[PDB]
Coordinates of C-alpha atoms in Angstrom, one line a residue:
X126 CA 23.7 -3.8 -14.9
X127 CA 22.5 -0.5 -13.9
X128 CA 18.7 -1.7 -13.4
X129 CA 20.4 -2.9 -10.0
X130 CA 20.7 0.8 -9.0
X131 CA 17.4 1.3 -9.6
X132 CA 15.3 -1.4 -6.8
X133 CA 13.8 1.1 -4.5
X134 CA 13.6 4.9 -3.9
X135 CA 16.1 6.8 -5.4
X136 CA 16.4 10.4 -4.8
X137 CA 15.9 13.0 -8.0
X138 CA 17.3 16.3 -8.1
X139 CA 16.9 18.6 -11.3
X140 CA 18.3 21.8 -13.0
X141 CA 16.8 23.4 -15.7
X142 CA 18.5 26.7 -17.4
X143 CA 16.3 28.1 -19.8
X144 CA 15.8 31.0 -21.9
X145 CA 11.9 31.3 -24.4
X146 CA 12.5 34.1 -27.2
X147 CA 15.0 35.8 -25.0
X148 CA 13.3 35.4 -21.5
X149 CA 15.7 33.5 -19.5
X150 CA 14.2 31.8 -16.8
X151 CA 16.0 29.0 -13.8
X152 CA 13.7 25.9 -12.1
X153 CA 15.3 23.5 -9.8
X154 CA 13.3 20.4 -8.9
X155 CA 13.4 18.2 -6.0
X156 CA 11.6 14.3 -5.4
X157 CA 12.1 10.9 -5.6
X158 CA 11.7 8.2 -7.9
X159 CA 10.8 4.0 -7.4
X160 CA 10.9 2.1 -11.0
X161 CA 9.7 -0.7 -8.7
X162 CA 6.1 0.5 -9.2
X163 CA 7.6 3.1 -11.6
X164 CA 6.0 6.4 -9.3
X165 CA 7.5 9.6 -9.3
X166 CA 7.2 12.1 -6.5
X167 CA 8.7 15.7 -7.8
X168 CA 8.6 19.5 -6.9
X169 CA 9.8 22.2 -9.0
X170 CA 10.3 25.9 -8.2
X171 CA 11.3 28.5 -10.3
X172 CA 14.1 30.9 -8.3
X173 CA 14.1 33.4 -11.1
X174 CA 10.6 34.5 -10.3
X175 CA 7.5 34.7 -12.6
X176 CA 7.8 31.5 -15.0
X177 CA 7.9 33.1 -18.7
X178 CA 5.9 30.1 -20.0
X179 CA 3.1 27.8 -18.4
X180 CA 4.3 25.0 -16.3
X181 CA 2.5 22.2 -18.4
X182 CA 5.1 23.1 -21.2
X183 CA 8.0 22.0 -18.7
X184 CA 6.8 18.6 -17.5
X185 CA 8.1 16.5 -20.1
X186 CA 11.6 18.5 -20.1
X187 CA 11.9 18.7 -16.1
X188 CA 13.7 10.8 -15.9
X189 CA 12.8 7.8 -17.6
X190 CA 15.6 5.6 -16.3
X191 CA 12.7 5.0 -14.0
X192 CA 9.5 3.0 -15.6
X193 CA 8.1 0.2 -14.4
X194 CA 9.7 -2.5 -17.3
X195 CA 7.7 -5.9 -17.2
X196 CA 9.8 -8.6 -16.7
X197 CA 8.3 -10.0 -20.5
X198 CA 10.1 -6.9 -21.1
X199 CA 13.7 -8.1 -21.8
X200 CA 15.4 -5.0 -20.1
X201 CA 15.9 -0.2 -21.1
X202 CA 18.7 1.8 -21.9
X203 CA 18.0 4.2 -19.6
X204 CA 18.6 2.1 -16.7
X205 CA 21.6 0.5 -18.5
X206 CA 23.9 3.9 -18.8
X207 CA 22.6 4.7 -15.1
X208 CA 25.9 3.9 -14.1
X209 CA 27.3 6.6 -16.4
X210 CA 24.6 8.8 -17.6
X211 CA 22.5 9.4 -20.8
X212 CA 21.9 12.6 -23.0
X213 CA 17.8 13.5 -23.7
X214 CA 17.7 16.1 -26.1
X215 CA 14.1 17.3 -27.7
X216 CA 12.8 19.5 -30.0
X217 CA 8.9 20.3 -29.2
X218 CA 6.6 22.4 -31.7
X219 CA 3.9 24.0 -30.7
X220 CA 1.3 24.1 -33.5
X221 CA 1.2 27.8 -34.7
X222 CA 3.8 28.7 -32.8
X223 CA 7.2 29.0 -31.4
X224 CA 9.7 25.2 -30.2
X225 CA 11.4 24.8 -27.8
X226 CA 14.7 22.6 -28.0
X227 CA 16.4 20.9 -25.6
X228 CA 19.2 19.4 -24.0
X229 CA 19.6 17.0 -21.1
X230 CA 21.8 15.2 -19.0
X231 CA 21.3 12.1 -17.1
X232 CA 23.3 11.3 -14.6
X233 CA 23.9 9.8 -11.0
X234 CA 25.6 12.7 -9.0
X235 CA 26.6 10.6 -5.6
X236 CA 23.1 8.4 -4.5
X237 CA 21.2 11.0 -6.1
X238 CA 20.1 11.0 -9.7
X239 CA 20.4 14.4 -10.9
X240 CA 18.5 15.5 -14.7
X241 CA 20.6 18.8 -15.5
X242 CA 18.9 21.0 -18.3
X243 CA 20.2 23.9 -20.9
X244 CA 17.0 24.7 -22.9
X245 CA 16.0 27.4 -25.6
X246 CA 13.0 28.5 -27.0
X247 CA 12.5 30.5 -30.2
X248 CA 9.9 31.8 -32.5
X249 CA 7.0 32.2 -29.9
X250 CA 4.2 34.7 -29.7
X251 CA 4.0 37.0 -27.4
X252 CA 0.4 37.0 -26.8
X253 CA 0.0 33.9 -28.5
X254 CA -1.0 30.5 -25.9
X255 CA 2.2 30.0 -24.3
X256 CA 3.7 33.4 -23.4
X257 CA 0.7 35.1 -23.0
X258 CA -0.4 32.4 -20.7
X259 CA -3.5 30.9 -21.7
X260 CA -3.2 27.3 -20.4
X261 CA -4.5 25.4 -17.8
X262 CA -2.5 24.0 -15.3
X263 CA -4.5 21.1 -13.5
X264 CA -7.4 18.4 -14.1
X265 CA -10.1 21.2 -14.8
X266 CA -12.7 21.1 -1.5
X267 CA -12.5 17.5 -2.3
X268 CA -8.4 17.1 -0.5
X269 CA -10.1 19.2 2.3
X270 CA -14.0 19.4 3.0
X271 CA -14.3 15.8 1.8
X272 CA -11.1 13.5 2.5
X273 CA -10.5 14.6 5.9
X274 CA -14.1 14.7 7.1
X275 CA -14.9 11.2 5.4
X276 CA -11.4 10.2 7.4
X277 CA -12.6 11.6 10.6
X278 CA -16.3 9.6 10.4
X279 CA -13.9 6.8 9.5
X280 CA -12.3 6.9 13.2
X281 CA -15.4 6.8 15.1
X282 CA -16.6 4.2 12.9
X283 CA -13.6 2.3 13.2
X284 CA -13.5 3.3 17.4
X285 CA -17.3 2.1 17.4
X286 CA -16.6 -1.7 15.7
X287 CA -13.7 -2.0 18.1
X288 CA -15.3 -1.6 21.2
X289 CA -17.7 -4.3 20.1
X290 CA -15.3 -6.5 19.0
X291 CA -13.6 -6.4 22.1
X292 CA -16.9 -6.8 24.1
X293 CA -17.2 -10.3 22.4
X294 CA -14.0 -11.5 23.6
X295 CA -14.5 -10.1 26.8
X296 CA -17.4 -12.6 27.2
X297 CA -15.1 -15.4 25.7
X298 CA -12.3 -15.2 28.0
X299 CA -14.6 -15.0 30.7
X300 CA -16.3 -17.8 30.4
X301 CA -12.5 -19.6 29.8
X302 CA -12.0 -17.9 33.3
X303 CA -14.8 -20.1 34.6
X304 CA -13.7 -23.5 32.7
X305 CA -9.9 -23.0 34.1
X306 CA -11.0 -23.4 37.4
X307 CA -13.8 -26.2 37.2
X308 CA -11.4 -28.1 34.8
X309 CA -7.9 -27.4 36.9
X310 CA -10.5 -29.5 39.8
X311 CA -8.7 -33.0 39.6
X312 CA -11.3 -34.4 41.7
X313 CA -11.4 -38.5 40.4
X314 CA -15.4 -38.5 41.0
X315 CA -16.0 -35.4 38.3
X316 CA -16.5 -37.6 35.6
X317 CA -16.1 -36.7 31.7
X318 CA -19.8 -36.7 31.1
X319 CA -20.3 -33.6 33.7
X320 CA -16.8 -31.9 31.8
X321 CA -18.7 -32.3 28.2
X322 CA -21.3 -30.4 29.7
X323 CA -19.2 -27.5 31.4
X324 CA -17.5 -27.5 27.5
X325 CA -20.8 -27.5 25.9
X326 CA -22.4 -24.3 27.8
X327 CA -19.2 -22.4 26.7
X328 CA -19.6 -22.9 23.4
X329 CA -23.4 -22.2 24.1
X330 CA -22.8 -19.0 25.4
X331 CA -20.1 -18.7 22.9
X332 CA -21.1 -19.1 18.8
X333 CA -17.5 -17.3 17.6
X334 CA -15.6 -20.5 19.6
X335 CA -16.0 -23.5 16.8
X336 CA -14.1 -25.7 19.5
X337 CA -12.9 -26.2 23.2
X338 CA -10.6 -29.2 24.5
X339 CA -9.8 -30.3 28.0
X340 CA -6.5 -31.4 27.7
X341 CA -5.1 -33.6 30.5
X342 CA -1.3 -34.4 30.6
X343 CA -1.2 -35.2 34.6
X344 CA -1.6 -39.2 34.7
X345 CA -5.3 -39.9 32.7
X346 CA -3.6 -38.7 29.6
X347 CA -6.6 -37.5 27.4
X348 CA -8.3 -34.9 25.5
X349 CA -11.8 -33.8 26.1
X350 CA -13.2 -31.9 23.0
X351 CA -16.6 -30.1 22.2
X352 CA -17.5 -29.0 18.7
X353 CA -20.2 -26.8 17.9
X354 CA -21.4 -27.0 14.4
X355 CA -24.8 -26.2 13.2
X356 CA -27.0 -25.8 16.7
X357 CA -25.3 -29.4 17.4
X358 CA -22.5 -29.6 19.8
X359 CA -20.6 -33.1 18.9
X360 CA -17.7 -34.7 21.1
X361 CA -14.9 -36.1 18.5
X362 CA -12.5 -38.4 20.0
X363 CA -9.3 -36.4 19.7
X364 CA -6.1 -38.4 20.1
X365 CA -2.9 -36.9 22.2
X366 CA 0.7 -36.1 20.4
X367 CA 3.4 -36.7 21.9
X368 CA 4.5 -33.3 20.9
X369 CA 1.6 -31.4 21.9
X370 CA 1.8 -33.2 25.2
X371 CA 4.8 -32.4 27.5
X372 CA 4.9 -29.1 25.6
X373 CA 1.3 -29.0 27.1
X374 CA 3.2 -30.1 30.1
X375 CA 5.7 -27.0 29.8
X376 CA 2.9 -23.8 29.4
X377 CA 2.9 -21.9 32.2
X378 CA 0.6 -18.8 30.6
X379 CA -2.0 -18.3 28.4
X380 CA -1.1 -17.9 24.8
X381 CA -2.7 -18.0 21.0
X382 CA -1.2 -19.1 17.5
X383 CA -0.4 -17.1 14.2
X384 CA -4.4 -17.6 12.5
X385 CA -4.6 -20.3 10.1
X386 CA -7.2 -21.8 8.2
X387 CA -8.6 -25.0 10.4
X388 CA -9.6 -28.3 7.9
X389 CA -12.7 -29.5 9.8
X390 CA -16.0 -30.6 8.5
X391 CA -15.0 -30.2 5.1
X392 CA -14.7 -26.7 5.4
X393 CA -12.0 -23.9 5.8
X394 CA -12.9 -22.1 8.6
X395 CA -10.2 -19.0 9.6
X396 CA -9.3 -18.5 12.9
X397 CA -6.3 -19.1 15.8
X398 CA -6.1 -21.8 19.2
X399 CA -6.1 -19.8 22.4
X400 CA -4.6 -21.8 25.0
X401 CA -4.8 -21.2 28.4
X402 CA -2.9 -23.7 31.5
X403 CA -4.9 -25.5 33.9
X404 CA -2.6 -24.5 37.1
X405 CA 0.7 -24.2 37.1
X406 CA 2.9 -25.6 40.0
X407 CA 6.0 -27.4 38.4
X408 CA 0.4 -28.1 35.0
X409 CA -2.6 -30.9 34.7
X410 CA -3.5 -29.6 31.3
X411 CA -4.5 -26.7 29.4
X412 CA -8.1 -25.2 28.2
X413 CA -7.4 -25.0 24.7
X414 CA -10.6 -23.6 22.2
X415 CA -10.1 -22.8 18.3
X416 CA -11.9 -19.1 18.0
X417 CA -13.3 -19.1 14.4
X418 CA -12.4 -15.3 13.1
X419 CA -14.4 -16.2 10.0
X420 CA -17.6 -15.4 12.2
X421 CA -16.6 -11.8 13.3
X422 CA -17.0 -11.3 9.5
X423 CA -20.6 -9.5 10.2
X424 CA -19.4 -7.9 13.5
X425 CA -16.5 -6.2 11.1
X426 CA -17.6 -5.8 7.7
X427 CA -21.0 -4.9 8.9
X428 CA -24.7 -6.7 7.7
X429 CA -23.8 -5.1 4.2
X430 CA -20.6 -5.2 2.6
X431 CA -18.6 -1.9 3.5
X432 CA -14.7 -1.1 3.3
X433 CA -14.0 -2.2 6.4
X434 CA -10.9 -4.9 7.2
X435 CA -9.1 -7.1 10.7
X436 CA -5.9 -6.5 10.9
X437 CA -3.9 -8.9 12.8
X438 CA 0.2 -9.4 13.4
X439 CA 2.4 -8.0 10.9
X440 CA -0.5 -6.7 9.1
X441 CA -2.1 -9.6 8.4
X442 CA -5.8 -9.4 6.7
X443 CA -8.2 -11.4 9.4
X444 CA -11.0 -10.2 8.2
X445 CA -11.6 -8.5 5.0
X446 CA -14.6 -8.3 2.3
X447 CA -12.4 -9.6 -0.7
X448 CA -12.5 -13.1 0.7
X449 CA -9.6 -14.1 -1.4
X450 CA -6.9 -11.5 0.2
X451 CA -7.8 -13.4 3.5
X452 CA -4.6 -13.9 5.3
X453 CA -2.4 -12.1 3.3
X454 CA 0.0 -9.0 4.6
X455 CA -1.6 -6.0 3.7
X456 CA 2.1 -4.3 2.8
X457 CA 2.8 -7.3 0.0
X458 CA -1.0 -7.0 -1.8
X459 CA -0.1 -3.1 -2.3
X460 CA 2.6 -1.7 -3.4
X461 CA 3.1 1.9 -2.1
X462 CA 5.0 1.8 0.7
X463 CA 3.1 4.2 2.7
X464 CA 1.1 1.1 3.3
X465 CA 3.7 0.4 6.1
X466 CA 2.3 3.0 8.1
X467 CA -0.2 0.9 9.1
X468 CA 1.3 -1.7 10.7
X469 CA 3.1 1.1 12.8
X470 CA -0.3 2.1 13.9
X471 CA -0.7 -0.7 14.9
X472 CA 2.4 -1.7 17.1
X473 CA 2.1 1.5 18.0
X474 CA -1.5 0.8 19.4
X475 CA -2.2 4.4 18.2
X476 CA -4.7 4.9 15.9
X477 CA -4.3 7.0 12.8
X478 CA -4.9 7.6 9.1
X479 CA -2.6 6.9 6.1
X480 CA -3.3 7.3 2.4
X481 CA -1.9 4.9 -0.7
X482 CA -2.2 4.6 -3.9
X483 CA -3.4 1.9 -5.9
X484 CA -1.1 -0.4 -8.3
X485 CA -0.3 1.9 -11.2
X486 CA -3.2 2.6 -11.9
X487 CA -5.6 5.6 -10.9
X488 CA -6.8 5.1 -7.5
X489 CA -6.0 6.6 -4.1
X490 CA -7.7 5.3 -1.0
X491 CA -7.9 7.0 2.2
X492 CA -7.3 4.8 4.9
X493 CA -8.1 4.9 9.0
X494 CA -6.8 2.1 11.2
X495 CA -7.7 1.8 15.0
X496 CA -6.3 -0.8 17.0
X497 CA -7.1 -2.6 20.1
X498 CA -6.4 -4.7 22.4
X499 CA -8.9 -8.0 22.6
X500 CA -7.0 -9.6 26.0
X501 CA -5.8 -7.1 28.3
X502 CA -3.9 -9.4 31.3
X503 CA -0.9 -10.7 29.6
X504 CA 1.7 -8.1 28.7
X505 CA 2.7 -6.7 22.4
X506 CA 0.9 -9.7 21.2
X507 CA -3.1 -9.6 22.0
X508 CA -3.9 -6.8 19.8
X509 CA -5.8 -6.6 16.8
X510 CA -6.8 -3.1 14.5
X511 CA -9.8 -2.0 12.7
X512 CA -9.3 -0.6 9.5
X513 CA -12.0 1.7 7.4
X514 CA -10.8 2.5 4.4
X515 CA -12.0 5.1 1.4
X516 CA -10.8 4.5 -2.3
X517 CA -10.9 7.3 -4.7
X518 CA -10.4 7.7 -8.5
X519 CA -7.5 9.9 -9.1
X520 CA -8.1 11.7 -12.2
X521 CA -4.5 13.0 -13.8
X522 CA -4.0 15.6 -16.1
X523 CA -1.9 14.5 -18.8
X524 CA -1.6 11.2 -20.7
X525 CA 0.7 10.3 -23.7
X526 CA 1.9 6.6 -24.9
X527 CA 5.4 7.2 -25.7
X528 CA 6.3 5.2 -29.0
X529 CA 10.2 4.0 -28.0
X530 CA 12.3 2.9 -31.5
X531 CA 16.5 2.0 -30.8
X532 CA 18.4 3.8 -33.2
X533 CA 21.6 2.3 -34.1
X534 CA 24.0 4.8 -35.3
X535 CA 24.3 6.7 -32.0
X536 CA 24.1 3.6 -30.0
X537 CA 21.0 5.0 -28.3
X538 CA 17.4 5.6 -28.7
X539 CA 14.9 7.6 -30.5
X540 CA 10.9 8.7 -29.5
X541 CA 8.1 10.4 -30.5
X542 CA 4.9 11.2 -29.0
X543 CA 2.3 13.7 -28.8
X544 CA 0.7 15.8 -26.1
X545 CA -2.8 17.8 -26.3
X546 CA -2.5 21.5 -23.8
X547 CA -6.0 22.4 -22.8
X548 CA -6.6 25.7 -23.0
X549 CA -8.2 28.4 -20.4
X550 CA -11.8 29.2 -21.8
X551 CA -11.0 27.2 -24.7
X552 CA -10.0 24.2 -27.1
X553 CA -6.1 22.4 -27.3
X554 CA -2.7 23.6 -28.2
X555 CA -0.8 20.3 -29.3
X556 CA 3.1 20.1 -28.8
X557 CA 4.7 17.4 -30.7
X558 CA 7.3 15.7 -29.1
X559 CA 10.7 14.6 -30.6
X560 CA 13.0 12.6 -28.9
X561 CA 16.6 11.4 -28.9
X562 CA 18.4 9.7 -25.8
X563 CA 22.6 8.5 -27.0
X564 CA 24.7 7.9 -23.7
X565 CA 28.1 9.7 -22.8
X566 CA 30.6 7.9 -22.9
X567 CA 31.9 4.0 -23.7
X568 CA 30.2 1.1 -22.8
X569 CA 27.6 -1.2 -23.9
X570 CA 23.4 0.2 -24.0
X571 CA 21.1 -2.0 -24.3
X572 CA 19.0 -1.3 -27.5
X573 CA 15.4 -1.9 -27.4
X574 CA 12.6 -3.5 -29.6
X575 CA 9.5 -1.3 -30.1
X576 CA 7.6 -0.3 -27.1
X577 CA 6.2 2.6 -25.8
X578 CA 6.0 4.2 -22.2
X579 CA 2.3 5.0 -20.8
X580 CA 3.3 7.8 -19.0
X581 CA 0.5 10.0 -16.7
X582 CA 1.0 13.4 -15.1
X583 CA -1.0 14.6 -12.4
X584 CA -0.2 18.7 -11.4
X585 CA -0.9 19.7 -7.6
X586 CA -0.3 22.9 -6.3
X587 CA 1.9 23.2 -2.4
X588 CA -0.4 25.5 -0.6
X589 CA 2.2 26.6 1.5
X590 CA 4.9 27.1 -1.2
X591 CA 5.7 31.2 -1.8
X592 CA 7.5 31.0 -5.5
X593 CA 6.0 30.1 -8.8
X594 CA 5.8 26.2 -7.8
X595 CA 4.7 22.7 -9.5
X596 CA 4.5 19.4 -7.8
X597 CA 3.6 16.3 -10.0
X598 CA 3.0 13.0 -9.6
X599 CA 3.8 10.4 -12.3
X600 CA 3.3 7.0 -13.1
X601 CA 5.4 5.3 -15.7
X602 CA 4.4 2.1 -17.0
X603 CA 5.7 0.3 -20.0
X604 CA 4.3 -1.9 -22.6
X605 CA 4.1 -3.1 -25.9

């Protein structure tokens, strides 16, 4: 198949050996690539020195068998000589002014996909745009000043919610504390009317607890429930299961369920049961109350909407202002799997920042998590997190719609495409692209329609890096 190869990140190594009007010049490049989301995460270096000509120029030389290819598209020859390897040779002009021609080699080297490179480059200008070096290298603080202040506010912030949040349930479970031990009182002459009561005040005290139940599995098998809807506490006549009772009958400690969406009133309210036992010598019932998350919505999110989520188990999203995401794991919504590191944080219990980016688009947001403990006693699984999160456009440098045709004759593939160089102090130096991809070897490609590859380029800088350097981030999407 060969696409098989290519599910997850892959590791990219490449080699370029190059010489422009007679200076010969060396780059080796270092990164990873996931044709899941199609994202590509490379370094170069150049380990002969000075680079002759302006690292723009090399991008497209210095790995399309990634690409994010729809599933409407069929599927992709790149990925289909994978298991071999392909050849990429290009010529590029420069308008009024030298080409550079190329060769390349595309092949998995072990686990590792390696893109090995001869290319020379004639009829330049010395002086001219390219050797003299008159290019500009990125998209015309921020990273610095900015992200990791806005990050650091984010903490407190998100440190600040927390303690609030856990200063409601601190009043909830203490007020349980106090219905425990006048319900766990088997006394025949407290009658139900005087345990309605005790149930209603709870809930009185208590506006994020929809609903509390005395549940009674000792001999007067019942259920005792108060609901509080709108200023109105009501008593519905819950009946017993058969299941729910003796399993009743078996809890020993207090415990909560996964959240789920409760069908009452003729509404969807979000939230979990908290159960708690009423004694427990080889167990005359349990305290049981539904706490509605939906109404921590303003205690979270704030009186206005902000970027501000409740994370729960697995990272579940509790609370978030995109009401439709509600009870979804964070990690499956997004796909860059830095996204992960959050729900570390969490089990963790150690709060932290993490960054992602968003689809494959042009979007990175800067996210703080804090979690927290809401229930202390029992103990791993009472603990909730705070996230306050920051998304940013990500403006890239480059953008080009590669126009894909299948050629035939060579059993391969054939492109062209155009890219616009801006120049320092200055207008555009246009390098046209042409493109021809033929595999080594036997076996069968798979020829494509017509489509063409919206590729983007976005050129960093390492600060810490001591040779002529280049680290890029691409995102390769296809369509047509």
């Amino acid at each position: 198949k060969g696409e098989e190869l290519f599910t997850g990140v892959v590791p990219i190594l490449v080699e370029l050996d190059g010489d422009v009007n007679g200076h010969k010049f060396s780059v080796s490049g270092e990164g990873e690539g996931d044709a899941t989301y199609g994202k590509l995460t490379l370094k170069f270096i150049c380990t002969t020195g000075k680079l002759p000509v302006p690292w723009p120029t090399l991008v497209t030389t210095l790995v399309q068998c990634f690409a994010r290819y729809p599933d409407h598209m069929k599927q992709d020859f790149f990925k289909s000589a994978m298991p071999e390897g392909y050849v990429q040779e290009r010529t590029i002009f420069f308008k009024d002014d030298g080409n550079y021609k190329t060769r390349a080699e595309v092949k998995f080297e072990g686990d590792t996909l390696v893109n090995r490179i001869e290319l020379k480059g004639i009829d330049f200008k010395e002086d001219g745009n390219i050797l003299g070096h008159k290019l500009e290298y990125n998209s015309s603080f921020t990273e610095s000043v900015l992200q990791s202040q806005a990050t650091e506010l984010l903490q407190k912030k998100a440190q600040l919610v927390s303690f609030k949040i856990q200063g409601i349930m601190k009043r909830i479970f203490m007020g349980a504390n106090t219905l425990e031990k006048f319900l766990s009182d088997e006394n025949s002459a407290i009658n139900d009317t005087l345990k309605r009561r005790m149930l209603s005040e709870f809930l009185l005290a208590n506006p994020h607890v929809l609903l509390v139940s005395a549940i009674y599995t000792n001999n007067n098998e019942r259920v005792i429930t108060a609901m509080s809807m709108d200023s109105k506490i009501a008593y519905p006549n819950t009946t017993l299961n058969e299941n729910m009772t003796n399993q009743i009958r078996s809890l020993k400690s207090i415990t909560h369920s996964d959240p789920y969406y409760k069908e009452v009133n003729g509404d969807k309210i979000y939230g979990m049961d908290i159960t708690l036992p009423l004694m427990g010598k080889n167990a005359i019932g349990a305290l049981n109350f539904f706490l509605n998350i939906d109404a921590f919505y303003t205690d979270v999110v704030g009186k206005k909407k902000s970027n501000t989520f409740l994370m729960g188990k697995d990272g579940r999203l509790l609370i978030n202002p995109n009401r439709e995401i509600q009870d979804k794991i964070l990690s499956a919504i997004n796909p860059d799997r830095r996204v992960a590191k959050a729900v570390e944080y969490y089990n963790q219990n150690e709060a932290g920042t993490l960054s992602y980016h968003s689809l494959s688009g042009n979007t990175e947001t800067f996210l703080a998590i804090q979690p927290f403990d809401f229930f202390e006693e029992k103990g791993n699984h009472w603990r909730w997190a705070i996230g306050k999160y920051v998304n940013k456009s990500l403006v890239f440098s480059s953008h080009s719609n590669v126009y894909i045709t299948a050629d035939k004759q060579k059993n391969g593939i054939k492109a062209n495409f155009k890219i616009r160089h801006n120049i320092e102090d200055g207008g555009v130096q246009l390098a046209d692209h042409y493109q021809q991809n033929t595999p080594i070897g036997d076996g069968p490609v798979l020829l494509p329609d017509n489509h063409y590859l919206s590729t983007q380029s976005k050129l960093s800088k390492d600060p810490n890096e001591k040779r002529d350097h280049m680290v890029l981030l691409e995102f390769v999407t296809a369509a047509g």
